[PDB]
Structure 1
Amino acid sequence: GSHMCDAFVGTWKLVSSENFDDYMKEVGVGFATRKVAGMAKPNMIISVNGDVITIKSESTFKNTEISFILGQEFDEVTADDRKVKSTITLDGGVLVHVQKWDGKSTTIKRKREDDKLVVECVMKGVTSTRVYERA
């Protein structure tokens, strides 16, 4: 066992969202993508195999999948089609995911709170909170 496996592994379904449209605007997502992305009710699937963590987002809008080792930069094409350089670390039990592109930066934190997995997406001063529960 590991902390990561116990906390995060499994299949999660989105149950609430706040300020996601505003977050997407701050990121630079265009109107049509924001509208379609904002409707989605994704499942988030998290798995671990040795040192490799995989996070999948499955929805009618887009399916995404990242696999990574903590602390080790990788390439990511986001749901809104940004080509970013990402680094994910585990800081005090919180997965902290930094994306860099075009001189910009956004941070996504994933954490367990009670029976929820809370995803906080932050761009400058704009935060979106997306809450998931086990499927």
Structure 2
Amino acid sequence: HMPNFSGNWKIIRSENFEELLKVLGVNVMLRKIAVAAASKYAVEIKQEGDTFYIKVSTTVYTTEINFKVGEEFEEQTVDGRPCKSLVKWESENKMVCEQKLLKGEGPKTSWTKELTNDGELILTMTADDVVCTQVFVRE
């Protein structure tokens, strides 16, 4: 088991989170409470080959996804709406996920995760023209 995405990550920066949530139509007071909650984001990943288990948690809330690169799975937008998601590799250490809402119309959502050369995990989340960036380090 060589070094890959696998491991336990804690956030150290969080740029544009508030504006992402605005685009997704979250009200001011909840955006502010979500920004506070976001400085305790922790991520646990177990990666085997193509196949991923990911646990994202804050203080009061936790979610898990399991997916295979290339195969459709069901999950949620940053704002809770169910969606069909599909993950593709973009390079050795970057994956990108396109999301389509199960029900309704709304903004085009996507995320990426990427391991950098100096051992950080970077997560981007996109809603239309707005890009949120979160940097994590090994716990």
TM-score (norm 2): 0.83
Residues of 2 paired with 1:16 and 1:68: CA distance? Answer: 26
1:6 to partner: Cα distance: 2.8
Q: Identical aligned pairs, as a percentage?
A: 34
- Corresponding position: 1:124 with 2:121: no
Alpha carbons 1:87, 1:97 under 8 Å: kept: yes
Residues of 1 paired with 2:73 and 2:136: CA distance? Answer: 25
Change (3 A) 1:116 1:32: same
CA RMSD of aligned residues (A): 2.0
1:131 to partner: Cα distance: 0.5
In structure 2, what is the equivalent of residue 112 of structure 1? 115
1:58 to partner: Cα distance: 1.3
What secondary structure is seen at the aligned counterpart in 2 of 1:8? Answer: coil
Aligned length: 132
Change (3 A) 1:50 1:95: closer
Alpha carbons 2:5, 2:47 under 8 Å: kept: no
1:43 to partner: Cα distance: 0.5
In structure 1, what is the equivalent of residue 10 of structure 2? 13
Residues of 2 paired with 1:82 and 1:42: CA distance? Answer: 20
Equivalent AA in structure 1 for residue 99 of structure 2: Q
Residues of 2 paired with 1:68 and 1:92: CA distance? Answer: 18
For each residue in 1:91-132, what CA deviation from the matched residue of structure 2 results, as whole angstroms up to 9, or x when unmatched?
A: 212111222213442111111122211111112211111010
Superposition pairs of residues 1-135 of structure 1, within 5 angstroms: 6-40=3-37, 41-49=40-48, 51-78=50-77, 80-93=79-92, 94-101=94-101, 102-103=104-105, 104-113=107-116, 114-135=118-139
Alignment gaps of 5+ in structure 1:
none
TM-score (norm 1): 0.85
Change (3 A) 1:30 1:81: farther
1:78 to partner: Cα distance: 4.3
